[PDB]
Each structure stands twice: as C-alpha cells, then as structure tokens.
C-alpha cells in the first residue's frame, strides 16, 4: 500500500503564462482523450490570420511556435496524468475488494488480527485525511470498508488506540457533511459510521469526558451541519434519506443524556419540524420494503421529541392533530 501518494501532485499542473493562444480551448479535442490535431488546425488557422493581418508577423512567430511546443507537451502530460489517475483508481478498487473479501471470509480469531486491523486503520487515516473533500471516487471504496469494519468489532493499550482513532474518524465525517461533499451515496456511509459511534462507543468518568468532548465537535459546525442533514431527508435517494433520518435520532438521544437541548432547538429554526409534521399527511400511501423502514424512523424521531419538556412547545405549535386527521389512518 505504497502507490497512494499525493506528494507527486498528479492533479496539480503548473500553468504557464500563455500570453497568446490563451483563448484556444480544447473543446473539439475531447474516454478522456484530447486530440492534438484539433488544436493544431485551430492554432494554424490563427497563425495564418495573424500573418495576413500584417502586424509584426516575423518577430512574433517564434512566440507562437514555442507556445505550440509547450501546448503539445501540456496535452501529453494531461493525458498521462489522466491515465495514471484511472490506473490508481482501478488499483484502489481492486485492493478494497480484496480487503473486503478477506475480512468477510475469515473464520480465524480476531484478537490476533487486531494488530493488522490497527495497522490498516493507521494506513487509511492519512488517505482519508488527504481525500476527505478532494475527490468522490476514492473515498467511496475507503468509506464502505470502514463501515463494515466498525460493525464486525494489554487490552487497555489497544482499547485506547481504537477509541482514539474512532474519535478522529468521527471528525472527518461531520466535516464532510457540513460542506455537502460527494454524492448522496458517499454521504450516506458517513451517517452509519457516526451512528454506531454515538450509539455504542459513547453509550464512569471516562464516559463523561468522551460525551462532553463529542458534543463540542457537533456544536463547532452548528446549523451549517444540521442544515445538510435536514435536506437529505425526504429527498430523491432512498437510502440517504433513511440513514439521515435515523442519524438525527442518535443526535437528540445522546444530547439529552449530556431541561433543554440545543439540537432540538436548531431543528425548529431550520423549519425541519414544520415540514416534518406536514409529511405526516397521506402516510397511508407511503406505508422489508424500503418505504416501510423509512416511515419507521420518521415516526420514531417524533416520539423522541415528545419526551422532553421543551419539545411539547415546538411540536404542539405545528398543529399535528389536524395533520393526522386528513390521512384517515384511524
């Protein structure tokens, strides 16, 4: 696992000044394959037009010549970089598939393989930190492997290293959710990781310190983070809205354990409780099936808000009595 290296900067490219021919784009050039003749003909026509203009044609010819000699190598370097990037992507996908097949089909004990597990975690930590919001293709292969790994889980020293990385891994997830990076598929995996972390790891002085510091990370982002999660719900995707809805349950649940709560208050300001009660209408149409499990998390969340004293104020003002009557479920 030494082929993932960003020091070479295969994505970054030094762009020369290009005082001339700057407007000549690679439109007709483009399977990423930029043809060189499509730009050669254009620059030749432009040189001919400039020569016909009769304005310092002999002197400025060498400038156009060297600009073309630089543009051809620029195109070749871009093609080589694209090839290297796709090759690295294929290799990373193959390695991730191999690691998944190895972890899944493994009857051997886990306490001896804990060393290799920690080594893989240490190796992927910098990979995730370097590609947290750069590209949405490599994180996918590396995001799902961490998901299953978290569910398939001297002892004191190991317990500290695990909990330490699980806390660091929790930060990069909320950081991506606050910026709405990647596709809804990748954004869904992050919800499952943070879900079990806030449900199993945190849930006794050691527990208080972890719970206290955990809430600090959530408060750092504020409404910016919750706004993204609230938008994912009742969306186009079927699995993203489900994971996002269940995620909110863990946030409000762990917050009460820490008579009021800032998480529930933010949901009201973002108009989340309002639209949520509105969706209660026509619930009979929505209700193993993906639609059934989604509604379960929906009604389950509302049940939690009705347990705190402050929830009755915001929930009652939503006029939920008239919303459940139009559906005729009773």
């Amino acid at each position: 696992f030494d082929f993932i290296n960003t020091d070479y900067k295969w994505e970054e490219i030094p762009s020369p000044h290009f005082t001339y021919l700057k407007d000549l784009d690679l439109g007709p050039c483009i399977g990423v394959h930029y043809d060189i003749r499509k730009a050669q003909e254009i620059l030749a026509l432009k040189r001919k037009e400039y020569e016909h203009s009769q304005l310092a044609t002999p002197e400025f010819l060498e400038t156009v010549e060297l600009e073309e000699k630089v543009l051809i190598e620029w195109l070749t370097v871009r093609n080589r970089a694209n090839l290297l990037l796709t090759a690295r992507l294929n290799l990373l996908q193959a390695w991730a598939n191999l690691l998944l097949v190895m972890i899944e089909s493994n009857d051997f004990k886990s306490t001896p393989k804990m060393a290799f597990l920690l080594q893989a975690l240490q190796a992927i930590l910098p990979t995730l930190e370097a590609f947290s919001s750069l590209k949405s293709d490599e994180a996918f292969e590396l995001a799902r492997v961490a998901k299953v790994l978290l569910w398939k889980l001297e002892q004191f020293t190991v317990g500290n290293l695990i909990g330490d990385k699980l806390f660091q891994l929790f930060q990069l997830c909320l950081s991506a959710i606050s910026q709405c990076s990647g596709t809804p598929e990748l954004r869904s995996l992050y919800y499952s990781i943070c879900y079990r972390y806030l449900t199993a790891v945190v849930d006794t002085r050691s527990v208080t310190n972890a719970r206290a510091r955990t809430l600090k990370a959530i408060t750092l982002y504020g409404d910016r983070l919750l706004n993204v999660i609230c938008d994912d719900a009742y969306g186009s995707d079927t699995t993203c809205q489900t994971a996002a809805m269940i995620l909110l349950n863990a946030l409000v649940h762990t917050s009460r354990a820490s008579v009021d709560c800032p998480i529930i208050d933010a949901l009201n300001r973002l108009n989340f409780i309002g639209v949520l009660v509105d969706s209660l209408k026509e619930i009979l149409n929505e209700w193993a099936s993906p639609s059934q499990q989604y509604t379960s998390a929906k009604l389950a969340l509302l049940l939690q808000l009705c347990q705190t004293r402050q929830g009755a104020k915001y929930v009652l003002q939503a006029n939920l009595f008239r919303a459940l009557e139009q559906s005729g479920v009773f």
Partner: peptide, 17 residues
C-alpha cells in the same frame, strides 16, 4: 503588425502577409 501576422499564420494567409 505582429498581431496581423499572427492572424495570417493562424489562418494561413501567406499571400496576405
């Protein structure tokens, strides 16, 4: 002039240049 020429090059107008 150099601009003119550059356009004669770019378009291949040797008779114009």
């Amino acid at each position: 002039i150099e601009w003119m020429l550059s356009i004669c090059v770019e378009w291949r107008l040797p008779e114009i240049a």
